[PDB]
Amino acid sequence: AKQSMKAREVKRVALADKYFAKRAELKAIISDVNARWNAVLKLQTLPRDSSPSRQRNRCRQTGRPHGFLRKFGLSRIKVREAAMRGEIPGLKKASW
Amino acid sequence: ARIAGINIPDHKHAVIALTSIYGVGKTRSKAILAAAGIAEDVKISELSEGQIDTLRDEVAKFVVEGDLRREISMSIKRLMDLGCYRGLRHRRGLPVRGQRTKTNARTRKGPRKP
Amino acid sequence: RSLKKGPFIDLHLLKKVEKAVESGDKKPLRTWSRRSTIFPNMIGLTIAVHNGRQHVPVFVTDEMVGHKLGEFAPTRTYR
Amino acid sequence: RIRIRLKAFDHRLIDQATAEIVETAKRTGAQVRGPIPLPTRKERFTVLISPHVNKDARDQYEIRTHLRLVDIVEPTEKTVDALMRLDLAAGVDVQISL
Amino acid sequence: GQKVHPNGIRLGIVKPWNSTWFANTKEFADNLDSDFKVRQYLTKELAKASVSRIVIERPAKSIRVTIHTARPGIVIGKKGEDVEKLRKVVADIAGVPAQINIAEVRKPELDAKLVADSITSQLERRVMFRRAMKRAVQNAMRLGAKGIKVEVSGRLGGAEIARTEWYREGRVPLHTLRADIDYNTSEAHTTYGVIGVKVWIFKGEI
Amino acid sequence: PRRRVIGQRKILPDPKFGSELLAKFVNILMVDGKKSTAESIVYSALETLAQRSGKSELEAFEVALENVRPTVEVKSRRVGGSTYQVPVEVRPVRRNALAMRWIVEAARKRGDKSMALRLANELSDAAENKGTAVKKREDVHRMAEANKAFA
Amino acid sequence: NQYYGTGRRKSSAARVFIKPGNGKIVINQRSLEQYFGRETARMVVRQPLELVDMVEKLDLYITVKGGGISGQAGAIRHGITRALMEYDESLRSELRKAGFVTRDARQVERKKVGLRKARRRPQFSKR
RNA sequence: CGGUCCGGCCGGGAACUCAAAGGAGACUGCCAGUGAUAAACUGGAGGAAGGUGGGGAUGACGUCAAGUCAUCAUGGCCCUUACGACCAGGGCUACACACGUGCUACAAUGGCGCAUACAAAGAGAAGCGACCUCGCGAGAGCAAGCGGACCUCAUAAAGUGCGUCGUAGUCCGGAUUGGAGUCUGCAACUCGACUCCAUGAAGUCGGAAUCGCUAGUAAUCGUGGAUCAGAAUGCCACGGUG
Ligand SMILES: [Mg+2]
Ligand SMILES: [Mg+2]
Ligand SMILES: [Mg+2]
Ligand SMILES: [Mg+2]
Ligand SMILES: [Mg+2]
Ligand SMILES: [Mg+2]
Missing domain, CATH: 3.30.1140.32 (Ribosomal protein S3, C-terminal domain)
Known part of the structure; x- marks a missing residue:
């Protein structure tokens, strides 16, 4: 779904871990009841795309960022298009 | 039976009568009667004056009635005087807190005609 | 109404707000930091907040403190 | 004492590569508290079937995940040496520890 | 369009599953990409190889993949070469070791x-x-x-x-x-x- | 009803009386699927009525219900550009059901307090036929016996 | 010994124990009245003992899980009537005409894609 | 049954509930009636289940040049130091209105207060988060268990018992606004959700017209999930009463 807008998410997913979880960790304990030296919620001036909440979640195969699913990493279309061909283990049309 | 504000309410349970005040919802009205040795539901039919003024002063504490309306209209006017967005909203007869205006803004907008 | 434990403003803007003291004021300051909570240390400035198309001039007043800069920079040109 | 949880998406495959183990126990070792079924976890997913619009559409799928318990009582070097390397049947998660 | 997929409908019965492994929520997805990535490379390299259907199971930190082809000789090559070159790439795609069979098409x-x-x-x-x-x-x-x-x-x-x-x-x-x-x-x-x-x-x- | 005719399911009797009719009545009055409360409302009204007539209990209902009870009604025809609405003879099984529904639906439109009170006051009102319900009789009997030339 | 008889109804499962003693009831370790023997099924629990005299003849201890009031109730009803084969299958024939023998196969209808709930169809536009 | 700290909690027990694999069972088959002595239908017996038992999945050749070039793919066409590309702020959240779909109500078949009885189905390690502590509160601090019939998300709500209200724009209804807060997130002005205090519109049953549902349904009461850092009256699913 538009190459550029796709690479963007890869750069974001990368940043997410180059910095965040890492040096970003310093805000959990840093900025909560540990009382104040203000340089705390200040150093939060790193890339920007460096953040999990900034990633989207795109159909791993196409890129379509809607109709997505966590189990499979795909969006309803290609998910079904594969489900109907084995492809997705254990998955078949259910009823009850 | 005015008390604190010029309002003269009664003929129902106390907790509920107290709510006529422009400044007491169930909660305040609880902390009131429960701060006097008065009961939840004792009418005024039994409440002697000298048992009422111990209340009048308990309510004298927090801003109500006139002084309240004043305070509030004031805060609003402050908004307007600044020229922010909540202000421009109060001044422009539209919903302050973000509600859609494309439709259903009738309370802050007034019945429709055009 | 929000932030809880410590108000927020952008750094670049803060610098623009300190530098503009010991070197006197001047023409409008330009930020896009509609995100920042106004500090007393801003009063009597001219900070100009971007509103989409342009930066409107806003005169930091006695008590425009606990608010954001974005509040005074209307964006939708209704009517 | 020796407990093994089994899981997979094929039922008439799990209980088979299960009976492999039970028999491979009450042949060499002994005891074993039978093949206890356990509850199946069915995670369903429902998705729109038309690429554009039509929400009444939709296809409903499920993934049944069946379990078995096992539980062998007499850890005989012979039976404990029987389980290992005689395991096969891929597409079946087995767990022995806690 | 009003026809149900004649393959996927049968799955429960009378029809296999071209991916038959088992995984938990945790890496089910990361595995799915791998899966429908190696078929991607594979149906590309072996297009002239008359490939009918690739199959996959993941035997514990490992992958198998049986390729159903109708011209196996050409896929196997000289003394194993054609399957050899495949071993590598596929293994450096899945992230694990990889056998790789070659079911003939009767x-x-x-x-x-x-x-x-x-x-x-x-x-x-x-x-x-x-x-x-x-x-x-x-x-x-x-x-x-x-x-x-x-x-x-x-x-x-x-x-x-x-x-x-x-x-x-x-x-x-x-x-x-x-x-x-x-x-x-x-x-x-x-x-x-x-x-x-x-x-x-x-x-x-x- | 276009092909597959039927009859009608039947219900357990009145849990506290044993009658089919009354249970039918409670259903008629029930709402939001509230049986527990519905019956509580029915018995209380039949109780206040019970004493307030002194005239037994079982037939305090029967009598007042014999007043609403209809004999003929009207089925619209709309035959040829005309509504030609013909009178028909109501069956001895629906009759009672309708009377019940006019009673319940009538008290419903009363301006009293409890639905029980409203009920009882309609019930006893019919015992001396002058209620809304009885008027519905003095309405459906008007409509037919007029269109009665359409026999 | 004992005379068992499961019996169930809509998500509910109720196991009944029958011993000759008295007209008391040991439902989930409490009185018949201590549970729901007066509510929206006051005596649907007593029913199985209508044309099969009781009063103080036989005693019964019952457990039940799942469902709600009247569902557990009816469940038990059934379970009793089934454990009540004890005397003979001679009474479990006019107990049939009572209907207490039939498992009420009625279940919650499932919700279905496209509908507001089971049958209920999302109101659609004029024309 | 035996031990008992009244807990299925310890032995144990393998009966039962239940769990999930494999089976049986229902077919107009039998009895009778209607029917051309047929098909079927009706009623009855037995039976957990009678006449496709209930619900699903399954959607023929074809119709509308219906919908989707923006999921993807692709013939053709077009820009290619720009129709491509990075960034910041805004807009997709506008408001004289009109229409569709829904939620919440107008109330004593109820509102409120206290006590209290019964589900089902599902979710969970960059996760679900006890307990204890602090706050009236949303929450926060410290912290066990659980990759899950073990632990947690949960403490069902209708209901039932008593007390209150006595048909009033109310003790209904909760919009709207003021003030102060919580949390997630680099960030809640545009534009989050929730909480505490106060605030109390319209609304007292809705014209013409019109929609849904034939049984565990309609009506009604709560529960869970997907997408998701964080926005559900929507959507998908679950059972209560009926
Ligand atoms: Mg592309
Ligand atoms: Mg996101
Ligand atoms: Mg068919
Ligand atoms: Mg077309
Ligand atoms: Mg209220
Ligand atoms: Mg139908």
Whole structure:
């Protein structure tokens, strides 16, 4: 779904871990009841795309960022298009 | 039976009568009667004056009635005087807190005609 | 109404707000930091907040403190 | 004492590569508290079937995940040496520890 | 469009599953990409290798992959080479070690995917579509095949209006669950469009 | 009803009386699927009625219900550009059901307090036929016996 | 010994124990009245002992899980009547005409894609 | 049954509930009636289940050049130091209105207060988060268990018992606004959700017209999930009463 807008998410997913979880960790304990030296919620001036909440979640195969699913990493279309061909283990049309 | 504000309410349970005040919802009205040795539901039919003024002063504490309306209209006017967005909203007869205006803004907008 | 434990403003803007003291004021300051909570240390400035198309001039007043800069920079040109 | 949880998406495959183990126990070792079924976890997913619009559409799928318990009582070097390397049947998660 | 996928409908019964491993929520996805990534590389390298259907199981931190091809010799190569080169890449794709078998295709005109793919290489090759379907169906009932139908559609022969032209022969009950039905798709990228091919083959009872 | 005719399911009797009719009545009055409360409302009204007539209990209902009870009604025809609405003879099984529904639906439109009170006051009102319900009789009997030339 | 008889109804499962003693009831370790023997099924629990005299003849201890009031109730009803084969299958024939023998196969209808709930169809536009 | 700290909690027990694999069972088959002595239908017997038992999945050749070039793919066409590309702020959240779909109400078949009885189905390690502590509160601090019939998300709500209200724009209804807060997130002005205090519109049953549902349904009461850092009256699913 538009190459550029796709690479963007890869750069974001990368940043997410180059910095965040890492040096970003310093805000959990840093900025909560540990009382104040203000340089705390200040150093939060790193890339920007460096953040999990900034990633989207795109159909791993196409890129379509809607109709997505966590189990499979795909969006309803290609998910079904594969489900109907084995492809997705254990998955078949259910009823009850 | 005015008390604190010029309002003269009664003929129902106390907790509920107290709510006529422009400044007491169930909660305040609880902390009131429960701060006097008065009961939840004792009418005024039994409440002697000298048992009422111990209340009048308990309510004298927090801003109500006139002084309240004043305070509030004031805060609003402050908004307007600044020229922010909540202000421009109060001044422009539209919903302050973000509600859609494309439709259903009738309370802050007034019945429709055009 | 929000932030809880410590108000927020952008750094670049803060610098623009300190530098503009010991070197006197001047023409409008330009930020896009509609995100920042106004500090007393801003009063009597001219900070100009971007509103989409342009930066409107806003005169930091006695008590425009606990608010954001974005509040005074209307964006939708209704009517 | 020796407990093994089994899981997979094929039922008439799990209980088979299960009976492999039970028999491979009450042949060499002994005891074993039978093949206890356990509850199946069915995670369903429902998705729109038309690429554009039509929400009444939709296809409903499920993934049944069946379990078995096992539980062998007499850890005989012979039976404990029987389980290992005689395991096969891929597409079946087995767990022995806690 | 009002037809249920004749393959995926059967899954519960009478039909396998081209991916048969097991994984938990945690890496089910990361595995799915791998899976439908190696078929991606694989149906690319072995397109002229008449590949009918790749299969995958993940035997504990490892992957197997059985390639169903109709011209295995060409895929195996000289003393193992053609499968050798594959070992590598596939292993450096999945993230694990990888065996890799090569199931032979007994009589390929019974394989929907290979029928279709044929009928496709045909259109690309520039043959009369009518002829292609015809031959396919014929020399398909030639050797068993209780039934069969091919349907190729869209800019047939090269018109500005789109057609569908199907060709049923024999017996084909999509409505019966217990019936053996092989069905597939193959796109033709024609020098002016993209003709869609679908084929159904009916092999029998229980 | 276009092809597959039927009859009608039947219900357990009145949990506290044993009658089919009354249970039918409680259903008629029930709402939001509230049986527990519905019956509580029915018995209380039949109780206040019970004493307030002194006239037994079982037939305090029967009598007042014999007043609403209809004999004929009207089925619209709309035959040829005309509504030609013909009178019909109501069956001895629906009759009672309708009377019940006019009673319940009538008290419903009363301006009293409890639905129980409203009920009882309609019930006893019919015991001396002058209610809304009885008027519905003095309405459906008007409509027919007029269109009665359409026999 | 004992005379068992499961019996169930809509998500509910109720196991009944029958011993000759008295007209008391040991439902989930409490009185018949201590549970729901007066509510929206006051005596659907007593029912199985209508034309099969009781009062103080036989005693019964019952457990039940799942469902709600009247569902557990009816469940038990059934379970009793089934454990009540004890005397003979001679009474479990006019107990039939009572209907207490039939498992009420009625279940919650499932919700279905496209509908507001089971049958209920999302109101659609004029024309 | 035996031990008992009244807990299925310890032995144990393998009966039962239940769990999930494999089976049986229902077919107009039998009895009778109607029917051309047929098909079927009706009623009855037995039976957990009678006449496709209930619900699903399954959607023929075809119709509308219906919908989707923006999921993807692709013939053709077009820009290619710009129709491509990075960034910041805004807009997709506008408001004289009109229409569709819904939620919440107008109330004593109820509102409120206290006590209290019964589900089902599902979710969970960059996760679900006890307990204890602090706050009236949303929450926060410290912290066990659980990759899950073990632990947690949960403490069902209708209901039932008593007390209150006595048909009032109310003790209904909760919009709207003021003030102060919580949390997630680099960030809640545009534009989050929730909480505490106060605030109390319209609304007292809705014209013409019109929609849904034939049984565990309609009506009604709560529960869970997907997408998701964080926005559900929507959507998908679950059972209560009926
Ligand atoms: Mg692309
Ligand atoms: Mg996001
Ligand atoms: Mg069929
Ligand atoms: Mg078209
Ligand atoms: Mg209220
Ligand atoms: Mg129907």
